[PDB]
Amino acid sequence: SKGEELFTGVVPILVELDGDVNGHKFSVRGEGEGDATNGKLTLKFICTTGKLPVPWPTLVTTLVLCFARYPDHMKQHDFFKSAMPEGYVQERTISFKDDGYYKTRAEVKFEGDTLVNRIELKGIDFKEDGNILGHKLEYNANSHNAYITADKQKNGIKSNFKIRHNVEDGSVQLADHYQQNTPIGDGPVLLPDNHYLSTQNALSKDPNEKRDHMVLLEFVTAAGITLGMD
C-alpha cells in the first residue's frame, strides 16, 4: 500500500464523539497532532456539552492506531496505515466488570490534510452508584500491551485486551475490550502476523481551561515480531 507515506511528518488530528450512557448524553471534541515516526500523540479534549458524566480515563481507548510506531522490520504488519487515506472502521465493546458496557463505532480516515476520528458511543446497564457513573476512578492510566491478530474472513484485524482502571479506594476496575477493524475502501491492505502494541499515557489539565477537559500525551509502539535474519 501507499498509506504509510502520509505519516512521515506531523499530522493534525480531529476527534469528534457523540455519547449516550444510560441516557446521559454528551459530546467531546478534541484536537492536536500525531507524529508516527516517534509513535507520539498530543491532544486536548473538551466536553462541549458541559460536564462529562463518565470519567475521562474510561474514554482514552475510544478517543487512532495509525500513529503507532512500527519498527522498520515490522512495516509490513501495519494494517492501520495501509488502509489510508480511505480509512478503517473501528468497533469495540468495552465490558466493565460488575457494571455496564460501552459499544462504539468509529470511522478513522483522512479528510483533507487532517486525520479524523469520528465516534458514536452507547453505554448500557451501568450502575448509577458504580465506579463509572459515580466518578470513583483516579485521573491516570496504566501502561498496557494489546495483542493484534489478523481476521482473514473479514479483511481486517482483531484484538482483545484488558484495561485496568485505578479506583480511588485502591481497588482496580477491569475494562474488557473486544475490538475489530475493517477497511473502508476496497484497495489492498496488509494483514499482520501476531504481534502487540505497547502503550503509555499521561493525563493532565490545562491551567487556563475552564471547561471539563483532558490533556493527553500517548505513545504507541509495535513489537512482538522477532528480528534476526535481516
Short mmCIF file of all heavy atoms in Angstrom, two decimals, residues 88-143, unseen atoms left out:
data_model
loop_
_atom_site.label_atom_id
_atom_site.label_comp_id
_atom_site.label_asym_id
_atom_site.label_seq_id
_atom_site.Cartn_x
_atom_site.Cartn_y
_atom_site.Cartn_z
N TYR A 88 -10.37 3.09 8.06
CA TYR A 88 -10.96 1.86 8.55
C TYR A 88 -12.07 2.20 9.52
O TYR A 88 -12.15 3.33 10.03
CB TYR A 88 -9.93 0.95 9.23
CG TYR A 88 -9.11 1.64 10.31
CD1 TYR A 88 -9.56 1.72 11.63
CD2 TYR A 88 -7.88 2.20 10.01
CE1 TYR A 88 -8.79 2.36 12.61
CE2 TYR A 88 -7.12 2.83 10.98
CZ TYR A 88 -7.56 2.91 12.27
OH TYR A 88 -6.76 3.53 13.20
N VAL A 89 -12.92 1.22 9.77
CA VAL A 89 -13.91 1.27 10.83
C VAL A 89 -13.34 0.53 12.03
O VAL A 89 -12.81 -0.58 11.89
CB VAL A 89 -15.24 0.66 10.38
CG1 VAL A 89 -16.20 0.52 11.55
CG2 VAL A 89 -15.84 1.51 9.28
N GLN A 90 -13.45 1.15 13.21
CA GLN A 90 -13.01 0.55 14.46
C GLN A 90 -14.23 0.39 15.36
O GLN A 90 -14.89 1.38 15.68
CB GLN A 90 -11.94 1.42 15.15
CG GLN A 90 -11.43 0.84 16.48
CD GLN A 90 -10.06 1.38 16.87
OE1 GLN A 90 -9.09 1.25 16.12
NE2 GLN A 90 -9.97 1.99 18.05
N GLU A 91 -14.52 -0.85 15.76
CA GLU A 91 -15.67 -1.15 16.61
C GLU A 91 -15.21 -1.90 17.85
O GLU A 91 -14.41 -2.83 17.76
CB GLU A 91 -16.72 -2.01 15.86
CG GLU A 91 -17.40 -1.30 14.70
CD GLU A 91 -18.31 -2.23 13.90
OE1 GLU A 91 -18.11 -3.46 13.96
OE2 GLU A 91 -19.23 -1.72 13.20
N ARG A 92 -15.72 -1.50 19.01
CA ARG A 92 -15.44 -2.19 20.25
C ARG A 92 -16.72 -2.41 21.04
O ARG A 92 -17.70 -1.68 20.89
CB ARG A 92 -14.46 -1.41 21.15
CG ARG A 92 -13.06 -1.14 20.54
CD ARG A 92 -12.02 -1.10 21.67
NE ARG A 92 -10.65 -0.81 21.17
CZ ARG A 92 -10.16 0.41 20.96
NH1 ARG A 92 -10.92 1.50 21.16
NH2 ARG A 92 -8.91 0.57 20.54
N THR A 93 -16.69 -3.43 21.89
CA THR A 93 -17.49 -3.44 23.10
C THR A 93 -16.50 -3.46 24.25
O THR A 93 -15.52 -4.21 24.24
CB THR A 93 -18.46 -4.64 23.18
OG1 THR A 93 -17.78 -5.79 23.71
CG2 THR A 93 -19.01 -4.97 21.81
N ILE A 94 -16.74 -2.59 25.22
CA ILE A 94 -15.92 -2.48 26.41
C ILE A 94 -16.80 -2.89 27.58
O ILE A 94 -17.76 -2.18 27.90
CB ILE A 94 -15.37 -1.06 26.60
CG1 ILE A 94 -14.52 -0.66 25.39
CG2 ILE A 94 -14.60 -0.98 27.92
CD1 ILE A 94 -14.17 0.86 25.29
N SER A 95 -16.48 -4.02 28.21
CA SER A 95 -17.30 -4.56 29.29
C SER A 95 -16.63 -4.26 30.61
O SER A 95 -15.56 -4.79 30.91
CB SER A 95 -17.50 -6.07 29.11
OG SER A 95 -17.96 -6.36 27.81
N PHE A 96 -17.27 -3.42 31.42
CA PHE A 96 -16.75 -3.13 32.75
C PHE A 96 -17.23 -4.21 33.72
O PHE A 96 -18.42 -4.50 33.78
CB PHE A 96 -17.19 -1.74 33.20
CG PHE A 96 -16.64 -0.63 32.32
CD1 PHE A 96 -17.29 -0.26 31.15
CD2 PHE A 96 -15.45 0.02 32.65
CE1 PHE A 96 -16.80 0.75 30.33
CE2 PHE A 96 -14.92 1.04 31.82
CZ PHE A 96 -15.60 1.40 30.67
N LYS A 97 -16.30 -4.79 34.46
CA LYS A 97 -16.65 -5.89 35.35
C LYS A 97 -17.51 -5.39 36.50
O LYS A 97 -17.18 -4.40 37.15
CB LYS A 97 -15.40 -6.58 35.89
CG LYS A 97 -15.70 -7.77 36.79
CD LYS A 97 -14.45 -8.43 37.32
CE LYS A 97 -14.76 -9.46 38.41
NZ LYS A 97 -15.70 -10.51 37.93
N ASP A 98 -18.61 -6.12 36.76
CA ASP A 98 -19.59 -5.76 37.79
C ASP A 98 -20.25 -4.42 37.49
O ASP A 98 -20.57 -3.66 38.42
CB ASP A 98 -18.96 -5.73 39.19
CG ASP A 98 -18.55 -7.11 39.69
OD1 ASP A 98 -18.95 -8.12 39.06
OD2 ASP A 98 -17.83 -7.17 40.71
N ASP A 99 -20.46 -4.11 36.21
CA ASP A 99 -21.04 -2.83 35.80
C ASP A 99 -21.45 -2.98 34.33
O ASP A 99 -21.47 -4.09 33.79
CB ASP A 99 -20.05 -1.68 36.04
CG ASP A 99 -20.74 -0.39 36.42
OD1 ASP A 99 -21.83 -0.11 35.87
OD2 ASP A 99 -20.21 0.36 37.27
N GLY A 100 -21.75 -1.86 33.68
CA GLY A 100 -22.27 -1.87 32.32
C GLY A 100 -21.22 -2.00 31.24
O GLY A 100 -20.07 -2.38 31.50
N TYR A 101 -21.62 -1.68 30.00
CA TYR A 101 -20.75 -1.85 28.84
C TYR A 101 -20.91 -0.71 27.84
O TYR A 101 -22.01 -0.22 27.62
CB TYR A 101 -21.00 -3.21 28.13
CG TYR A 101 -22.36 -3.43 27.46
CD1 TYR A 101 -22.56 -3.10 26.12
CD2 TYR A 101 -23.41 -4.03 28.14
CE1 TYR A 101 -23.78 -3.33 25.49
CE2 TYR A 101 -24.64 -4.26 27.51
CZ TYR A 101 -24.81 -3.91 26.19
OH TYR A 101 -26.03 -4.13 25.57
N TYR A 102 -19.79 -0.27 27.24
CA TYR A 102 -19.86 0.63 26.09
C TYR A 102 -19.87 -0.19 24.82
O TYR A 102 -19.22 -1.23 24.72
CB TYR A 102 -18.65 1.59 25.99
CG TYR A 102 -18.38 2.57 27.13
CD1 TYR A 102 -17.09 3.12 27.29
CD2 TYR A 102 -19.37 2.98 28.00
CE1 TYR A 102 -16.82 4.02 28.31
CE2 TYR A 102 -19.12 3.88 29.02
CZ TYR A 102 -17.83 4.40 29.17
OH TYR A 102 -17.56 5.29 30.18
N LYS A 103 -20.57 0.32 23.81
CA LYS A 103 -20.43 -0.11 22.43
C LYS A 103 -20.08 1.09 21.57
O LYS A 103 -20.76 2.12 21.64
CB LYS A 103 -21.73 -0.75 21.90
CG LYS A 103 -22.16 -1.98 22.65
CD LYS A 103 -23.12 -2.83 21.80
CE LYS A 103 -24.11 -1.98 21.00
NZ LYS A 103 -25.00 -1.12 21.84
N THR A 104 -19.02 0.96 20.77
CA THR A 104 -18.51 2.08 20.00
C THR A 104 -18.33 1.70 18.54
O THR A 104 -17.98 0.56 18.22
CB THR A 104 -17.16 2.59 20.58
OG1 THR A 104 -16.16 1.58 20.40
CG2 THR A 104 -17.31 2.86 22.05
N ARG A 105 -18.58 2.66 17.66
CA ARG A 105 -18.25 2.52 16.25
C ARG A 105 -17.61 3.81 15.78
O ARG A 105 -18.20 4.89 15.92
CB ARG A 105 -19.49 2.20 15.40
CG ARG A 105 -19.17 2.00 13.93
CD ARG A 105 -20.43 1.86 13.10
NE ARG A 105 -20.14 1.71 11.67
CZ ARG A 105 -19.90 2.73 10.85
NH1 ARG A 105 -19.90 3.97 11.30
NH2 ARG A 105 -19.66 2.49 9.57
N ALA A 106 -16.40 3.71 15.24
CA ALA A 106 -15.64 4.87 14.80
C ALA A 106 -15.25 4.72 13.34
O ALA A 106 -15.04 3.61 12.85
CB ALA A 106 -14.38 5.04 15.67
N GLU A 107 -15.15 5.85 12.64
CA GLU A 107 -14.50 5.92 11.34
C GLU A 107 -13.24 6.77 11.46
O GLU A 107 -13.30 7.94 11.85
CB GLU A 107 -15.43 6.49 10.27
CG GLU A 107 -16.68 5.63 10.04
CD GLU A 107 -17.52 6.11 8.86
OE1 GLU A 107 -17.17 7.14 8.25
OE2 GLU A 107 -18.53 5.44 8.56
N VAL A 108 -12.10 6.16 11.13
CA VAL A 108 -10.80 6.80 11.19
C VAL A 108 -10.33 6.97 9.75
O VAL A 108 -10.12 5.97 9.05
CB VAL A 108 -9.80 5.95 11.99
CG1 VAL A 108 -8.44 6.65 12.06
CG2 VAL A 108 -10.33 5.66 13.38
N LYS A 109 -10.20 8.21 9.30
CA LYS A 109 -9.78 8.44 7.93
C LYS A 109 -9.39 9.88 7.70
O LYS A 109 -9.69 10.76 8.51
CB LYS A 109 -10.90 8.04 6.96
CG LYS A 109 -12.18 8.83 7.13
CD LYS A 109 -13.25 8.38 6.15
CE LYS A 109 -14.51 9.22 6.28
NZ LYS A 109 -14.93 9.38 7.70
N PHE A 110 -8.70 10.12 6.59
CA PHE A 110 -8.28 11.46 6.24
C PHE A 110 -9.43 12.26 5.65
O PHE A 110 -10.20 11.74 4.83
CB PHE A 110 -7.12 11.42 5.24
CG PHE A 110 -5.77 11.41 5.88
CD1 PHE A 110 -5.09 10.22 6.10
CD2 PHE A 110 -5.17 12.59 6.27
CE1 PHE A 110 -3.84 10.21 6.69
CE2 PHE A 110 -3.91 12.59 6.87
CZ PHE A 110 -3.25 11.39 7.08
N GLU A 111 -9.55 13.52 6.06
CA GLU A 111 -10.47 14.48 5.48
C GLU A 111 -9.63 15.70 5.14
O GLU A 111 -9.35 16.54 6.01
CB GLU A 111 -11.62 14.86 6.43
CG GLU A 111 -12.56 13.72 6.77
CD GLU A 111 -13.73 14.16 7.64
OE1 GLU A 111 -13.86 15.36 7.96
OE2 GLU A 111 -14.53 13.28 8.04
N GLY A 112 -9.21 15.81 3.89
CA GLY A 112 -8.23 16.83 3.57
C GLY A 112 -6.91 16.41 4.16
O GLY A 112 -6.51 15.24 4.06
N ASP A 113 -6.23 17.35 4.80
CA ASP A 113 -4.93 17.08 5.41
C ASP A 113 -5.02 16.57 6.85
O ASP A 113 -3.98 16.31 7.46
CB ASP A 113 -4.05 18.34 5.37
CG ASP A 113 -4.68 19.51 6.10
OD1 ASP A 113 -5.93 19.61 6.09
OD2 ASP A 113 -3.93 20.32 6.68
N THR A 114 -6.23 16.42 7.38
CA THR A 114 -6.45 16.09 8.79
C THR A 114 -6.90 14.64 8.93
O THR A 114 -7.84 14.21 8.24
CB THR A 114 -7.48 17.03 9.41
OG1 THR A 114 -7.01 18.38 9.34
CG2 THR A 114 -7.74 16.68 10.86
N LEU A 115 -6.25 13.90 9.83
CA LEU A 115 -6.73 12.59 10.25
C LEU A 115 -7.90 12.80 11.22
O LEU A 115 -7.72 13.43 12.27
CB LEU A 115 -5.61 11.80 10.93
CG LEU A 115 -5.74 10.30 11.24
CD1 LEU A 115 -6.60 10.03 12.48
CD2 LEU A 115 -6.24 9.50 10.03
N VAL A 116 -9.07 12.26 10.88
CA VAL A 116 -10.28 12.46 11.67
C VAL A 116 -10.71 11.13 12.29
O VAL A 116 -10.70 10.09 11.62
CB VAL A 116 -11.42 13.05 10.83
CG1 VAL A 116 -12.66 13.25 11.70
CG2 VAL A 116 -10.99 14.34 10.22
N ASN A 117 -11.09 11.18 13.57
CA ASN A 117 -11.65 10.04 14.27
C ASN A 117 -13.06 10.44 14.71
O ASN A 117 -13.21 11.29 15.59
CB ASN A 117 -10.80 9.68 15.48
CG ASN A 117 -11.33 8.49 16.23
OD1 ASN A 117 -12.12 7.71 15.69
ND2 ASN A 117 -10.91 8.33 17.49
N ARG A 118 -14.09 9.83 14.11
CA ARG A 118 -15.48 10.22 14.39
C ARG A 118 -16.22 9.03 14.99
O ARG A 118 -16.33 7.98 14.35
CB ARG A 118 -16.15 10.72 13.10
CG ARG A 118 -17.48 11.43 13.34
CD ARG A 118 -17.99 12.15 12.10
NE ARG A 118 -17.33 13.43 11.86
CZ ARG A 118 -16.50 13.66 10.85
NH1 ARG A 118 -16.25 12.70 9.98
NH2 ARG A 118 -15.95 14.85 10.69
N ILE A 119 -16.71 9.18 16.23
CA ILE A 119 -17.13 8.06 17.06
C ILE A 119 -18.57 8.24 17.50
O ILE A 119 -18.99 9.34 17.86
CB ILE A 119 -16.26 7.93 18.33
CG1 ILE A 119 -14.76 8.00 18.00
CG2 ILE A 119 -16.59 6.65 19.08
CD1 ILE A 119 -13.96 8.83 18.98
N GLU A 120 -19.32 7.13 17.52
CA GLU A 120 -20.59 7.03 18.22
C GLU A 120 -20.43 6.03 19.36
O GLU A 120 -19.98 4.90 19.13
CB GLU A 120 -21.71 6.57 17.29
CG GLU A 120 -22.13 7.56 16.22
CD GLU A 120 -23.21 6.99 15.31
OE1 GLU A 120 -23.21 5.76 15.07
OE2 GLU A 120 -24.07 7.77 14.83
N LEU A 121 -20.79 6.44 20.57
CA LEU A 121 -20.70 5.59 21.75
C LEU A 121 -22.08 5.47 22.40
O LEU A 121 -22.76 6.49 22.58
CB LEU A 121 -19.71 6.17 22.76
CG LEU A 121 -19.50 5.42 24.07
CD1 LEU A 121 -18.07 5.65 24.56
CD2 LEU A 121 -20.46 5.85 25.18
N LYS A 122 -22.46 4.25 22.77
CA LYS A 122 -23.65 3.96 23.58
C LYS A 122 -23.25 3.13 24.80
O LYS A 122 -22.56 2.12 24.67
CB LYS A 122 -24.70 3.20 22.75
CG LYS A 122 -25.93 2.77 23.52
CD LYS A 122 -26.99 3.86 23.55
CE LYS A 122 -28.35 3.28 23.91
NZ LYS A 122 -29.42 4.32 23.86
N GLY A 123 -23.68 3.56 25.98
CA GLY A 123 -23.40 2.84 27.22
C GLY A 123 -24.69 2.33 27.86
O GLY A 123 -25.68 3.06 27.92
N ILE A 124 -24.65 1.10 28.35
CA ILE A 124 -25.86 0.38 28.75
C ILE A 124 -25.61 -0.38 30.04
O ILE A 124 -24.52 -0.91 30.27
CB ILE A 124 -26.33 -0.55 27.61
CG1 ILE A 124 -26.92 0.27 26.46
CG2 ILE A 124 -27.34 -1.60 28.09
CD1 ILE A 124 -26.82 -0.39 25.12
N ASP A 125 -26.63 -0.40 30.91
CA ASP A 125 -26.66 -1.24 32.10
C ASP A 125 -25.63 -0.83 33.14
O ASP A 125 -25.18 -1.66 33.93
CB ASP A 125 -26.51 -2.72 31.74
CG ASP A 125 -27.78 -3.30 31.16
OD1 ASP A 125 -28.86 -2.82 31.56
OD2 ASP A 125 -27.71 -4.19 30.29
N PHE A 126 -25.26 0.44 33.20
CA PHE A 126 -24.38 0.88 34.27
C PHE A 126 -25.15 1.11 35.57
O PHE A 126 -26.34 1.45 35.56
CB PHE A 126 -23.65 2.17 33.87
CG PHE A 126 -22.58 1.94 32.85
CD1 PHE A 126 -22.88 1.93 31.51
CD2 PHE A 126 -21.27 1.70 33.25
CE1 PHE A 126 -21.87 1.70 30.56
CE2 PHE A 126 -20.27 1.47 32.33
CZ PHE A 126 -20.57 1.47 30.98
N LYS A 127 -24.45 0.92 36.68
CA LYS A 127 -24.97 1.28 37.99
C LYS A 127 -24.78 2.77 38.22
O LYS A 127 -23.68 3.30 38.02
CB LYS A 127 -24.26 0.49 39.09
CG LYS A 127 -24.25 -1.01 38.88
CD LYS A 127 -23.57 -1.72 40.05
CE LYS A 127 -23.53 -3.24 39.84
NZ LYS A 127 -22.78 -3.95 40.92
N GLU A 128 -25.85 3.46 38.64
CA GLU A 128 -25.72 4.90 38.85
C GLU A 128 -24.83 5.23 40.05
O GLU A 128 -24.30 6.34 40.12
CB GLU A 128 -27.10 5.55 39.02
CG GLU A 128 -28.00 5.48 37.77
CD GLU A 128 -27.78 6.62 36.76
OE1 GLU A 128 -27.03 7.58 37.06
OE2 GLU A 128 -28.36 6.55 35.66
N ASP A 129 -24.64 4.28 40.96
CA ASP A 129 -23.73 4.42 42.09
C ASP A 129 -22.39 3.73 41.87
O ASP A 129 -21.60 3.62 42.81
CB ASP A 129 -24.38 3.88 43.36
N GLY A 130 -22.11 3.26 40.65
CA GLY A 130 -20.91 2.49 40.37
C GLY A 130 -19.67 3.35 40.19
O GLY A 130 -19.68 4.57 40.41
N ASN A 131 -18.58 2.70 39.79
CA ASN A 131 -17.32 3.41 39.61
C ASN A 131 -17.35 4.36 38.42
O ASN A 131 -16.57 5.32 38.38
CB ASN A 131 -16.15 2.43 39.43
CG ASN A 131 -15.81 1.67 40.70
OD1 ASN A 131 -15.86 2.21 41.81
ND2 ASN A 131 -15.45 0.40 40.54
N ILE A 132 -18.22 4.10 37.44
CA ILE A 132 -18.26 4.87 36.21
C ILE A 132 -19.16 6.08 36.42
O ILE A 132 -18.69 7.21 36.54
CB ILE A 132 -18.75 4.01 35.03
CG1 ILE A 132 -18.01 2.68 34.98
CG2 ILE A 132 -18.64 4.78 33.71
CD1 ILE A 132 -16.57 2.80 35.03
N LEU A 133 -20.48 5.83 36.49
CA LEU A 133 -21.42 6.93 36.68
C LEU A 133 -21.20 7.65 38.00
O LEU A 133 -21.54 8.83 38.10
CB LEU A 133 -22.85 6.40 36.59
CG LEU A 133 -23.29 6.00 35.18
CD1 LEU A 133 -24.79 5.68 35.14
CD2 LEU A 133 -22.95 7.10 34.17
N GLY A 134 -20.60 6.99 38.99
CA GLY A 134 -20.26 7.61 40.26
C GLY A 134 -18.95 8.36 40.34
O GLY A 134 -18.65 8.95 41.38
N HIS A 135 -18.15 8.35 39.27
CA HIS A 135 -16.88 9.10 39.21
C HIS A 135 -15.93 8.72 40.35
O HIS A 135 -15.43 9.57 41.08
CB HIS A 135 -17.14 10.61 39.20
CG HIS A 135 -17.92 11.08 38.02
ND1 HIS A 135 -17.32 11.51 36.85
CD2 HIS A 135 -19.26 11.20 37.82
CE1 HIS A 135 -18.26 11.87 35.98
NE2 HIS A 135 -19.44 11.69 36.55
N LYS A 136 -15.66 7.42 40.48
CA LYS A 136 -14.81 6.91 41.55
C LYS A 136 -13.43 6.46 41.05
O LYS A 136 -12.72 5.75 41.76
CB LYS A 136 -15.50 5.76 42.29
CG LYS A 136 -16.86 6.15 42.88
CD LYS A 136 -17.53 4.95 43.55
CE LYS A 136 -18.98 5.23 43.92
NZ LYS A 136 -19.64 4.01 44.48
N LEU A 137 -13.04 6.86 39.84
CA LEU A 137 -11.78 6.43 39.25
C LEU A 137 -10.75 7.54 39.32
O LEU A 137 -11.08 8.72 39.21
CB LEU A 137 -11.96 6.01 37.79
CG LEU A 137 -12.93 4.85 37.53
CD1 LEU A 137 -12.95 4.52 36.06
CD2 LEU A 137 -12.55 3.63 38.37
N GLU A 138 -9.49 7.14 39.50
CA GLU A 138 -8.41 8.11 39.53
C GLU A 138 -8.14 8.62 38.11
O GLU A 138 -8.41 7.94 37.13
CB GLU A 138 -7.14 7.47 40.11
CG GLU A 138 -7.32 6.92 41.52
CD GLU A 138 -6.02 6.44 42.13
OE1 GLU A 138 -5.03 6.29 41.39
OE2 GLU A 138 -6.00 6.21 43.37
N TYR A 139 -7.60 9.84 38.03
CA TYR A 139 -7.33 10.51 36.76
C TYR A 139 -5.91 10.14 36.33
O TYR A 139 -4.97 10.92 36.46
CB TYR A 139 -7.50 12.01 36.92
CG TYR A 139 -7.39 12.85 35.65
CD1 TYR A 139 -8.38 12.81 34.67
CD2 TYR A 139 -6.31 13.71 35.46
CE1 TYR A 139 -8.30 13.57 33.54
CE2 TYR A 139 -6.20 14.49 34.31
CZ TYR A 139 -7.20 14.41 33.35
OH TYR A 139 -7.13 15.17 32.22
N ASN A 140 -5.77 8.92 35.82
CA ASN A 140 -4.48 8.44 35.32
C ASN A 140 -4.75 7.22 34.44
O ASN A 140 -5.89 6.79 34.27
CB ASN A 140 -3.50 8.15 36.47
CG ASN A 140 -4.05 7.18 37.51
OD1 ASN A 140 -4.71 6.18 37.19
ND2 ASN A 140 -3.76 7.46 38.78
N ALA A 141 -3.69 6.67 33.85
CA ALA A 141 -3.85 5.49 33.00
C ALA A 141 -2.59 4.63 33.08
O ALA A 141 -1.48 5.15 32.96
CB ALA A 141 -4.14 5.89 31.55
N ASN A 142 -2.78 3.33 33.31
CA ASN A 142 -1.65 2.41 33.37
C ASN A 142 -1.18 2.04 31.97
O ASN A 142 -1.96 2.02 31.01
CB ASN A 142 -2.04 1.15 34.13
CG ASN A 142 -2.37 1.43 35.57
OD1 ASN A 142 -1.72 2.23 36.23
ND2 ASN A 142 -3.41 0.77 36.08
N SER A 143 0.12 1.73 31.85
CA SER A 143 0.67 1.24 30.59
C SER A 143 0.20 -0.20 30.36
O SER A 143 -0.03 -0.95 31.31
CB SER A 143 2.20 1.31 30.61
OG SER A 143 2.67 2.60 30.99
#
